[PDB]
Swiss-Prot record:
Active-site residues, as the UniProt record annotates them: S111, H272, D286
Gene that this sequence comes from: rep
Highest taxon listed in the record's lineage: Viruses
Protein name in UniProt: Papain-like protease nsp3
LRR repeat residues: 117-139
Length: 315
């Protein structure tokens, strides 16, 4: 008087939980919201082909809420749905190899994700949420759909929003292991004197104000609360890279003095991005398009550099 089939539910595709489903009911009445391979199967009953398949569900109990925090570092119950929604788009994007890197063919306002994807393939980063690191790896190999969909979900951005590459990175670094990154800087006032300031994690590897990492060790002008103009410089830096950002402006990029950079053209919040990377020569990745040049002069807003351990000589 009731027929049933075996299926496995999961919130991380890693702890599979055996269930038996009633072929006269929908996955919705039995499980709550259900996805099979991204497809919202909530309003559908079990077709017989489903035996043995794995389905994604929302974390209804407290075990799953833990199983899900461990995989994604989220408690937000909308996460699964926002992600599954982005994945419906990103599974259709193309992800070519350009210049030995995984890019994204232009689609639905995704210039800023491609510049972000390209940059992540060129700096040293371990992400803490296993969902991020698995998609990171798989994106290195060309299967970037899940990686991009997770970025959209972590950013509470959605396909078709135009993004900001610096902020996209800052959303992601919060779940990266930068716990041994250290930045010590010294700010010096003609009046007040000198104050050392020592910051760490995400704050140790990100700066907004100047693009030149060289300028940053020499000294950069910052206003002082006490009123005069002060000078801030870098005295120590342990971290494998550094992000230097500043609002778009014409800037020259010299082969071999940097890792890669975000070129942004247009106005606040409606411009386009392209990716500049320093290899044997300068390369410009625009989604599926690439160009080469000896030198580059143009509108740059982030420049990434390599570091291991720096110490100023300024006494
Ligand atoms: C492209 C884009 C999308 C979304 C968003 N916002 C920003 C605020 N945030 C709270 C929400 C998302 C911003 C940009 C954007 O233009 N960013 C850049 C920028 C930063 C700072 N000052 C700028 C000045 C002039 C021109 C560009 C500037 C990199 C180019
Ligand atoms: Zn789309
Ligand atoms: Zn765009
Ligand atoms: Zn986290
Ligand atoms: Zn002062």
């Amino acid at each position: 008087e009731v027929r049933t089939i075996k299926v496995f539910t999961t919130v991380d595709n890693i702890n599979l939980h055996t269930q038996v489903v009633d072929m006269s009911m929908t996955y919705g009445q039995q499980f709550g919201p259900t996805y099979l391979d991204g497809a919202d199967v909530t309003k559908i009953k079990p077709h017989n082909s489903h035996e043995g398949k794995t389905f994604y569900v929302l974390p209804n109990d407290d075990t799953l809420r833990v199983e899900a925090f461990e995989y994604y570092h989220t408690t937000d119950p909308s996460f699964l749905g926002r992600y599954m929604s982005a994945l419906n788009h990103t599974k259709k994007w193309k992800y070519p190899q350009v210049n030995g890197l995984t890019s994204i063919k232009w689609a639905d306002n995704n210039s800023y994700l491609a510049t972000a994807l390209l940059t992540l393939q060129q700096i040293e980063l371990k992400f803490n949420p296993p969902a991020l690191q698995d998609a990171y790896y798989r994106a290195r190999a060309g299967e970037a759909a899940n990686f991009c969909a997770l970025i959209l979900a972590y950013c509470n951005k959605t396909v078709g929003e135009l993004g900001d590459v610096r902020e996209t990175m800052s959303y992601l670094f919060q779940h990266a292991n930068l716990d041994s990154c250290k930045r010590v800087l010294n700010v010096v006032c003609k009046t007040c004197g000198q104050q050392q300031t020592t910051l760490k994690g995400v704050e140790a590897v990100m700066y907004m104000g100047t693009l030149s990492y060289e300028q940053f060790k020499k000294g950069v002008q910052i206003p002082c609360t006490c009123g005069k103009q002060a000078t801030k410089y870098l005295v120590q830096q342990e971290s494998p890279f550094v992000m230097m950002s500043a609002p778009p402006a014409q800037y020259e990029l010299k082969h071999g003095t940097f890792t890669c950079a975000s070129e942004y053209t247009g106005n606040y919040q409606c411009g386009h991005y392209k990716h500049i990377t320093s290899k044997e020569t300068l390369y410009c990745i625009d989604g599926a398009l690439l160009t080469k040049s000896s030198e580059y002069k143009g509108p740059i807003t982030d420049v990434f550099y390599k570091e291991n351990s720096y110490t100023t000589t300024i006494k």
